[PDB]
């Protein structure tokens, strides 16, 4: 905390002020005692949203176009801390888009092989995954044309190094395997990243908020496997990081995990992940989990990890709203309380 | 520039490679698929 | 390939044996060189018909 | 007509060419050079191997004669292996090269 | 005039002009066989055409080697020292200079082997600027000969 | 004298320095990295701040450990009387043996007092725990110190 | 006499001039380590 | 190649060490006599300006450390940009903490006459300013960086809430004690030092 | 008294009162002007009010040239180790309180003129943040120009 | 010749560095220990007072460079010998480079032990026996530098 | 004595780091600011002759070295005082350490200007005003220089 | 000049460097392989002390440190030769900078098998037969100790 | 002047350097791989007994240290020449520099070969070939140093 | 005397030392870089093994090439030996030493990059050969230099 605010004083404090904005339990509060999407515009105008849905007037408001301009301003937000970083810190902000643009290439190489329209396969992207040759993922099918062709001057380049093309073009099977795998050495190497070059304080509560991810998507990628696929553990194991707090003794189990019961008993010995795979929604438990470490990343001052910690605490924010505004025009309220509130 | 190299080139490497006993050498080398350059030639 | 060592070895060897005989001061002429010249004559000479046994048993193969 | 694009390269025209002047006279040393190292290469073999081979002591001997055909193939293989194929072929290559600079630049 | 400390001076330019130009051709040589053993999985045609680059980089160790024997040849137990001094400023004209001109012709070997796999006429590219990149290391061959020219030249 | 050469004060006052300067040091970084802790939770239970103080003053009264002991220094100090060798280098040693037992005692209440103040604000339970790795992590520099004042007082 | 090559003015002449190099070198590692924020200059 | 210079360096004073030890000549290595004889104007002088030099440089470095971050901060709340100043002037005021002790010493700073140059008294005063003004220096960049640290996370806190920033001062006041004990101790070792006669 | 070795200290301290007062004014001027010129590319009529921080780090380096030349008008090649020490003493204060001035308006300067295009209110703000650290390369400026005075007495 | 006046110097380093080395190993002990500490009694309350007993055992390290460092400070003399500053430089070196070791070994075994004691109960007696050998070494360090101290000022002259 | 043997060393090494750390602050700032000139001129080549100017007002540090170097070589002798060797140390240093920075400040605003300048076009002349600041950092050096540079050899024995 | 007045240094720092660069060995032995017993034992704690023997094997190399430094320390002398402080200052060395390895060797080994023992049981006759030979440096460098302090006072004059 | 005092003192540091640094080469060679058979084995514990064969050849060359340090000191008197102890100091540091090499190249193909000989039961053959490569190293480095001690005390005065 | 002091013989020490030590450097690094290679490309291609222990043979010649100037200069040390006799043979071992240094640094990295892609591509194998040798005549040269300074250690020595 000695050499931070060298390049880092501007971005930290706005990022805290941006923090500021989080809404708390009381704002979420009154924001399902709302009866109406108008209602619920203008209760989030007195907020730090305020004035974002200003272009709309009530008429053309539906809660798609809330959850796309209140992403829209995390985005723009997220821009602009990031036009102002320079070194570490601007290569740190690469790193976190990188992981968008995984799910952008897997997006747009599905909306070719279903043959729907490039113009509608794109508005569906993720803004924060933007490289310039993403349209042009529209241009062959299999694989290795469209690596060495489009995906060489991407920074995703060195994450095809285990994508075994066997001259099979793309089914929906295989870019899922393509996605997990890219992924996964993007995991690898983002934790490199985050052990080699970030400093001491916003290390260590940013391999943990990085080890988590990697668990998350090891167990999401070990339970997804039963009902839709059916593979060996020798390739499923290309699948799961190696970065973790579940990597050397629970992915082994994860692997050969042929039943839920696998999945249980391999998450039953970890500590802190037990319980999970019993009671209650696992994605309200993992985003539960997400935000409580992402509460206790705000808590160490001097740290990079903060703009991790702000902008997946403002994702959760926009899920919530969108949650809360998903029950107000459905006329559901029986679970519009399941918002996920730690600040 | 490759008719004046006819000479200038072995000649430029001569003083670079100057012995009688490698030379030889590498002159018999060279006569050898000179005078066999009907059987290499079509090989 | 070893009948062509064998012959540049009867050459070779043939010639450096009769500039030994001949006293030659290219190899006897220094004081670091061997005194005696038709004694490295005699073991040179028995070496080149080695190699030309050599060459005679290799060139009919 | 471009001015711009005579006088530009014109002064780079003047500049390579008073440049290369001193510099390929120089680069020609590399005829000297070549022929020192092969020069002292065969010297230097010669003194290890057959320099060896030569004594006025046993003579007639099987084994001061298979000391003579031993250091005869050492030296043999090693002047073809280095001396012809993999040091003619770099004076070769630098006779090629004083032709692709130094003579077709002019 | 002529100390008894002066071969070491002699020692020192006889050892750093293999040393130094040892390094630049070792390191020529491992980025070019890096950039070959890489481009040549798929193109084994212009496998013997892509060996310039390491031909390039021994012949700056036989540029370290020729005035390393030159010194060796001029060492005494009663030179002076003005000679040692002349023979440790040749080695060190030879040698680092052949270490920068090993650097030049590794990266650029390896940057023009793995690019003219794709285009045939980068060849006579990489050829052109490799020779810039070894008259670096026969200039310092140059200033080495003019410095042992003259380290016994008028020495009392 | 030569037992009391003149360049004696200079270990003394470096005794000084080193008692003043890395003991502050010491109660500089206990502070800091504490205060980071405690203002961490500044928004989250702003309630356990005024209570959570106590390793910002135990990191305080490490610099008035060092200060105790650069008074008892400086005050053996004087260009008239005599000045051995044996009590600058005893001065030397006596400031040496507490700055750095300050300085270590202050990394331990910085790491200390900053995770358990920050871990505070979920288990209120903590504070006692707290405090006593605190007191043994402050005692650290009471040892130096109470080595400073008996070396002190031998070496004069 | 303190020595005769490593005199009472040379060490303290080499002492000064090994502070003042020291920050110079902490000054210039200072300014090595200024980037610049691309991001703000870029249209994107 | 630091590791490596400071390696080198290591290696070189023990081989020198141990061959000046080795030929029995091991005293010739003295710092006794090379602080008898170097003079004693220039430890008094590098003293007096690496005082002023140390106490600026801790100063400015708290000055943008909580600087930086009040500017950060006062983005979306513009209401801690006069207010939490006094973070700057806490770190402000270990500069005219050196300043003032840089001046008192050079009081003491007069010319010595040749004859009496390297005395008891001219070589004590020379002594007691030079560790005088490094450990009021060093104290006062130590302070001016843990106030700067100190303030950086008040000026965030202040932003998060009003009622925090009188919390968090207590933690400025227990930081910026140490300049102030630097203050009193960089007075105490030069308080017998008499001017060089 | 007056030795050979004498102006080596008061030429050495002249350099470094210039040089380590240039290099902090080019830290100053650097940093804060990435800030100058990434804020104008949005809003390009803050152009000529976030100029003060490069002028304060050339009244910095004006500091410092001040000192080199008062200590070049007072050296000689017979003075004393006294005049030789006290230009360096005046060379070394100026030169490392003008290095941390100029860091410190570099740091602080690029951050207020980004501050300054979101929230208006906080010019005011890194102005007085500014005055701060312009003032200690004028702290250090008072020892130099003190220890001058006491060059030949 | 024998006893020279830069003599003390050696023993008063002595003195300093069972006291500097030492405590910085003591503080390394506590300080990354009582990490774990404050990260596990979160979920874990009870055990609050069973897992002070790395921090316990790295204080003892700090005693047993108190020890060596007043016993040494009792024996520093105007008019010592210089092996007596020698040995009592060697006592203070075989003290604090070793309970800085001890230090280290307490530090990073404790904090992983009470973070594996609060998930298991019986991890906690593994977890006292590794500390007892990793304190040994700071207990042969204070073994070596009393049996050396001990010879100091035994048959020393002039 | 006043005049030594080794004496010219100091005078020959401010002879040579005047022109040697200007010319590395000349080249940092050409570079790093050339660098930015040829990204920023594949887009808008019409404006490749004005972002020229941070690499001339580098290259001005190079000839404040020059002058400086041409003025210690002309004052250098084998029997100089010690004194003149300080003075020309200290010249040499002056002008070099303090162009480094010059240079260095030229290059970090020059290529974070002519990137900023062909998005808004208004922030030209705010380049070329903080260039100047960055500029006259040299350019004080150089007076430094020269005042010590006429005081070199004026009442030397 | 055979039996200087600076001959006791080396003899001291001979004492000295056999249990701090041996116990810096030890510590590491100890705490790399304690973290993994401490993260292995909280799902296999009836493994607790049969996982514990790379802790045993690493603090035997701190009693080889400990024998010699007694057996240089009782070896001291106020007037002794200089070749006396060569010899022990050479066998400190031999014991801490080859027990410092050793002990880098079972502390990497160590947590590799404790970690692995716990799944596969047939894994743990193999990390006591990799352990042995990691352990066995030490031995070797206390070997090397002891025929040289065998040697110190043998023949020694004036 | 042939014997001086300080004599010993290169070969006390000679006969420590002997076994230290084939120690520190041991060591790696033995903790890499021991990590290679701890990870290649908890799955196929079968090649338990046959993978040692790296943790043996990296013992070896520290008996190779043994064996030079016992003979160095064996070799060590208060009178010795200056001769002795530097050649014994070049004994030394020949079985100790070359026998950390070899640790470092058999710490390195040993877990390399024991990870790959797993999949491949036909690798094992070429690691110990290898292997034999690496520990000649070591060898090397014996047959210098027992050659320098031959000569230590063969003509000294 | 003066041409031939007492302290002669380090600089022939050294040079003997560092010739050998070098070159097992070297040839260390060209063993275990171009073994990771062959150990690698094995487990899918393993009839290729006797083939690629290239880089691994022309590596070992390496350190037959430190072996022999080793032999040679120790051959050669005297006690009252020239001072120009130690310098150059330091100057021969410095010779062979470091540049089969970078001939192993060479002789690693090909080998490893060639075994590699000669799995792959079978027409690489000789022109891995290829480079290798280019690789290995670097320190071909080193032993050259060394031989040629080994002639003059004493030829006219007084």
Not at chain 8, 109 to 131: H, I, R
């Amino acid at each position: 905390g000695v050499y931070f605010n060298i390049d880092n004083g501007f971005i930290e404090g706005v990022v805290r002020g941006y923090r500021n904005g989080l809404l708390s339990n009381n704002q979420y509060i009154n924001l399902t005692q709302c009866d109406t999407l108008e209602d619920l515009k203008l209760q989030l105008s007195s907020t730090d949203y305020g004035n974002f849905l200003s272009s709309v007037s009530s008429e053309s408001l539906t809660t798609s176009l809330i959850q796309e301009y209140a992403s829209s301003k995390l985005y723009h937000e997220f821009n602009y801390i990031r036009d102002q970083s320079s070194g570490s810190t601007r290569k740190f902000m690469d790193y976190i888009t990188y992981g968008y643009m995984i799910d952008n290439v897997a997006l747009m190489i599905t909306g070719t092989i279903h043959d729907r329209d490039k113009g509608e396969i794109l508005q569906r992207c993720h803004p924060l995954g933007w490289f310039d040759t993403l349209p042009t993922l529209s241009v062959a099918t299999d694989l290795e044309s469209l690596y060495e062709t489009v995906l060489v001057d991407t920074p995703l380049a060195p994450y095809f190094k285990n994508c075994f093309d066997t001259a099979e073009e793309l089914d929906d099977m295989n870019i899922e395997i393509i996605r997990n795998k890219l992924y996964k050495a993007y995991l690898e190497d983002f934790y490199n990243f985050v052990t080699e070059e970030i400093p001491e304080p916003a290390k260590e509560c940013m391999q943990t908020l990085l080890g988590f991810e990697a668990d998350r998507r090891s167990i999401n990628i070990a339970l997804n496997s039963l009902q839709s696929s059916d593979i060996d553990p020798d390739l499923k194991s290309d699948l799961l990081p190696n970065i973790g707090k579940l990597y050397p003794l629970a992915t082994f189990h994860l692997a050969q995990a042929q039943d839920f019961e696998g999945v249980r008993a391999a998450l039953a010995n970890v500590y802190e992940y037990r319980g999970f795979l019993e009671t209650g929604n696992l994605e309200d438990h993992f985003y539960q989990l997400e935000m409580e470490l992402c509460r206790d990343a705000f808590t160490q001052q001097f740290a990079i990890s903060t703009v991790w910690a702000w902008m997946k605490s403002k994702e959760q924010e926009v899920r919530n709203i969108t949650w809360i505004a998903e029950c107000i025009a459905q006329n559901q309220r029986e679970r519009i309380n399941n918002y996920i509130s730690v600040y | 520039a490759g008719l004046a190299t006819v000479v200038t080139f072995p000649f430029m490497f001569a003083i670079m490679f100057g012995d009688m006993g490698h030379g030889f050498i590498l002159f018999l080398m060279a006569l050898f698929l000179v005078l066999n350059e009907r059987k290499f030639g079509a090989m | 390939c070893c009948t062509v060592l064998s012959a540049f070895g009867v050459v070779i060897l043939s010639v450096i044996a009769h500039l030994f005989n001949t006293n030659h001061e290219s190899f006897v002429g220094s004081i670091n060189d061997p005194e005696d010249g038709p004694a490295v004559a005699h073991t040179v000479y028995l070496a080149a018909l080695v190699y030309l046994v050599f060459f005679v048993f290799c060139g009919f193969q | 007509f471009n001015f711009g694009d005579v006088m530009i390269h014109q002064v780079i025209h003047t500049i390579e060419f008073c440049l290369n002047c001193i510099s390929h006279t120089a680069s020609y040393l590399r005829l000297w050079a070549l022929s020192l190292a092969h020069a002292q290469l065969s010297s230097v073999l010669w003194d290890m191997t057959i320099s060896n081979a030569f004594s006025s002591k046993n003579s007639g001997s099987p084994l001061a004669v298979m000391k003579v055909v031993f250091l005869f193939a050492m030296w043999f293989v090693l002047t073809v292996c280095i001396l012809v194929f993999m040091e003619g072929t770099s004076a070769m290559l630098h006779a090629l090269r004083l032709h692709w600079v130094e003579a077709m630049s002019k | 005039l002529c100390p008894v400390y002066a071969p070491f001076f002699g020692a020192i330019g006889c050892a750093s002009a293999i040393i130094f130009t040892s390094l630049g051709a070792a390191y020529g040589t491992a980025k070019s066989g890096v950039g070959i053993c890489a481009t040549c999985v798929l193109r084994p045609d212009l496998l013997f055409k892509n060996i310039v680059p390491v031909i390039m980089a021994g012949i700056i160790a036989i540029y370290g080697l020729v005035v390393s024997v030159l010194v060796c040849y001029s060492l005494g137990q009663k030179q002076a020292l003005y000679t040692g001094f002349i023979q440790l400023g040749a080695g060190l004209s030879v040698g680092l200079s052949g270490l920068a001109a090993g650097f030049a012709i590794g990266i650029v070997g390896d940057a023009g082997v793995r690019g003219s796999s794709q285009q045939p006429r980068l060849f006579v590219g990489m050829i052109l600027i490799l020779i810039f990149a070894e008259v670096l290391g026969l200039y310092g061959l140059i200033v080495a000969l003019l410095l042992n020219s003259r380290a016994t030249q008028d020495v009392v | 004298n030569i037992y009391a050469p003149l360049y004696a004060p200079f270990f003394g006052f470096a005794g000084c320095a080193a008692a003043m300067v890395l003991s502050c040091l010491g109660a500089a970084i206990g502070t800091a990295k504490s205060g980071i802790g405690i203002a961490g939770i500044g928004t989250f239970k702003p309630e356990l701040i005024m209570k959570s103080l106590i390793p910002v003053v135990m990191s305080g009264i490490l610099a008035i450990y060092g200060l105790v002991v650069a008074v008892l220094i400086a005050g053996n100090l004087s260009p008239t009387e005599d000045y051995t060798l044996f009590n600058g280098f005893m001065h030397l040693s006596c400031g040496l043996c507490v700055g750095f037992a300050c300085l270590s005692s202050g990394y331990a209440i910085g790491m200390v007092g900053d995770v358990g103040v920050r871990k505070y604000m979920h288990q209120p339970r903590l504070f006692v725990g707290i405090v006593l790795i605190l007191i043994f992590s402050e005692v650290l520099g009471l040892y130096g110190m109470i080595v400073a004042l008996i070396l002190n007082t031998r070496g004069s | 006499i303190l020595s005769s090559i490593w005199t009472e003015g040379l060490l303290m002449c080499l002492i000064v001039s090994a502070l003042l190099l020291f920050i110079l070198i902490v000054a210039l590692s200072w300014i090595s380590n200024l980037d610049i924020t691309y991001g703000a200059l870029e249209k994107s | 190649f630091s590791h490596f210079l400071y390696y080198l360096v290591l290696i070189v004073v023990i081989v020198y060490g141990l061959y000046k030890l080795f030929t029995g000549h091991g005293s010739d290595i003295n710092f006794g006599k090379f602080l008898l004889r170097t003079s004693p104007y220039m430890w008094a002088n590098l003293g007096i300006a690496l005082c002023v030099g140390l106490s600026v440089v801790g100063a400015a470095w708290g000055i943008f450390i909580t600087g930086s971050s009040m500017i950060g901060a006062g983005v979306r709340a513009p209401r801690i940009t006069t207010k939490n100043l006094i973070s700057i002037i806490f770190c402000e005021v270990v500069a005219i903490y050196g300043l003032i002790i840089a001046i008192v010493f050079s009081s003491k700073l007069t010319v010595a006459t040749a004859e009496n140059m390297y005395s008891k008294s001219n070589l004590y005063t020379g002594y007691s300013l030079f560790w005088a003004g490094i450990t009021v220096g060093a104290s006062n960049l130590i302070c001016g960086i843990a106030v700067g640290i100190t303030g950086a996370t008040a000026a965030i806190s202040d932003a998060a809430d009003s009622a925090l920033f009188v919390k968090i001062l207590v933690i400025e006041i227990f930081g910026s004690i140490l300049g102030l004990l630097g203050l009193i101790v960089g007075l105490l070792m030069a308080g017998k030092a008499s001017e060089f006669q």
